[PDB]
Amino acid sequence: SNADDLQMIEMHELIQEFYYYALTKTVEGEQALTYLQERGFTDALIKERGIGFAPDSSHFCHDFLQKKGYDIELAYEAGLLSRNEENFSYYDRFRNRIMFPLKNAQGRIVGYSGRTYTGQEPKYLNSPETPIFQKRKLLYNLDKARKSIRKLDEIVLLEGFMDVIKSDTAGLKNVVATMGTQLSDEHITFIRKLTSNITLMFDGDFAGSEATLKTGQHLLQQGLNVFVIQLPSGMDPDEYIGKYGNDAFTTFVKNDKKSFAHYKVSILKDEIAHNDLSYERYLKELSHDISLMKSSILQQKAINDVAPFFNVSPEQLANEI
Numbered sequence: 001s002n003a004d005d006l007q008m009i010e011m012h013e014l015i016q017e018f019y020y021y022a023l024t025k026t027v028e029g030e031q032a033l034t035y036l037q038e039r040g041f042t043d044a045l046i047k048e049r050g051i052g053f054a055p056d057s058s059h060f061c062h063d064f065l066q067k068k069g070y071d072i073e074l075a076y077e078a079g080l081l082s083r084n085e086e087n088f089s090y091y092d093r094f095r096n097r098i099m100f101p102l103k104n105a106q107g108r109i110v111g112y113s114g115r116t117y118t119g120q121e122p123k124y125l126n127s128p129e130t131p132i133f134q135k136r137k138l139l140y141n142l143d144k145a146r147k148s149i150r151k152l153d154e155i156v157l158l159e160g161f162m163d164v165i166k167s168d169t170a171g172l173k174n175v176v177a178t179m180g181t182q183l184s185d186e187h188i189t190f191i192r193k194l195t196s197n198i199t200l201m202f203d204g205d206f207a208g209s210e211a212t213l214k215t216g217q218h219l220l221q222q223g224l225n226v227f228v229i230q231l232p233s234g235m236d237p238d239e240y241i242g243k244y245g246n247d248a249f250t251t252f253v254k255n256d257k258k259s260f261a262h263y264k265v266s267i268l269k270d271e272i273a274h275n276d277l278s279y280e281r282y283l284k285e286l287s288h289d290i291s292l293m294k295s296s297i298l299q300q301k302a303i304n305d306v307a308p309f310f311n312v313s314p315e316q317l318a319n320e321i
């Protein structure tokens with residue numbers, strides 16, 4: 001029910017204050033605080049994002065919510081507590097982790113991502129699916145980024161919320177990220193209400209490239225204008241910012257922004273040039289991709305940009321389309 005949903009949100013927003021205190025003030029949170037500071041987190045940024053620390057006692061959140069008069073089973077359903085199936089006892093889901101609040105589209109805290117700082121697995125532990133937290137719907141930073149997304153008529157999608165935090169601080173405000181999942185149909189429905197222009201800047205690795213191709217292809221099919229920013233090999237936005245700085249990052253992002261079709265063929269360049277079977281198949285694919293582009297202007301430029309990769313004229317490529 002809506003009443004129960006509000007209770008769950010309250011739990012999250014109240015424990016946030018305790019997590020924040022634990023991180024910034026307490027002895028147990030000292031190492032976690034140092035970790036964040038070494039990753040460039042100022043006191044102001046930590047406070048702004050409401051970042052905290054979950055102690056390792058396994059009953060920190062439990063006792064707090066119990067003291068505040070919340071139903072323990074509801075706290076379990078809210079994904080803040082886990083349940084020992086043997087004795088039906090409850091304990092903290094998040095233990096010895098740095099706690100990043102996950103806010104919904106209305107800016108209410110509906111879940112957490114807890115990062116290890118001692119090299120434990122998994123690196124990030126998220127809230128489970130709950131009535132208020134759904135990974136297929138939530139886009140990190142969306143409530144904060146909405147204004148700039150509308151103003152700039154563009155949304156930029158990153159892989160990690162950490163990248164979003166750093167990108168925002170660097171000056172790139174129209175950024176969001178899924179919680180480690182493939183962009184859903186629901187996400188795309190939400191996004192297209194804000195803008196038709198979506199730029200993908202995933203990590204500069206094989207998985208990032210594969211995700212870019214897959215996500216970009218689906219966005220293109222849905223009638224969105226897709227662009228790609230390709231980071232240097234082995235880097236994500238956070239790593240690029242840490243190595244080159246904020247100004248270099250915002251310049252880089254503004255520099256090479258390619259339409260999806262151009263990025264795609266550039267990735268397939270070597271295979272096309274050596275494999276005649278792949279040549280034919282990718283010429284057909286790229287022809288189909290370009291045909292899907294709603295922008296007549298960018299459709300024409302894509303034709304001019306893609307044609308050289310197949311050693312054909314723009315007129316020849318246009319004919320195939």
Ligand SMILES: O=c1ccn([C@@H]2O[C@H](COP(=O)(O)OP(=O)(O)OP(=O)(O)O)[C@@H](O)[C@H]2O)c(=O)[nH]1
Pocket residue numbers: 113115122123124125126159160161162163178179180181203236238
């Ligand atoms: O164990 C994991 C790892 C990743 N993820 C989800 O996948 C996204 C991309 O995972 P990454 O591992 O690329 O995140 P990152 O590099 O920004 O993390 P740091 O090492 O810099 O701290 C993350 O933002 C997270 O949402 C998890 O949920 N659990």
Ligand SMILES: [Mn+2]
Pocket residue numbers: 203205207208
């Ligand atoms: Mn990756």
Ligand SMILES: [Mn+2]
Pocket residue numbers: 159160203236
């Ligand atoms: Mn990354």
Ligand SMILES: [Mn+2]
Pocket residue numbers: 160162236238239
């Ligand atoms: Mn990273």
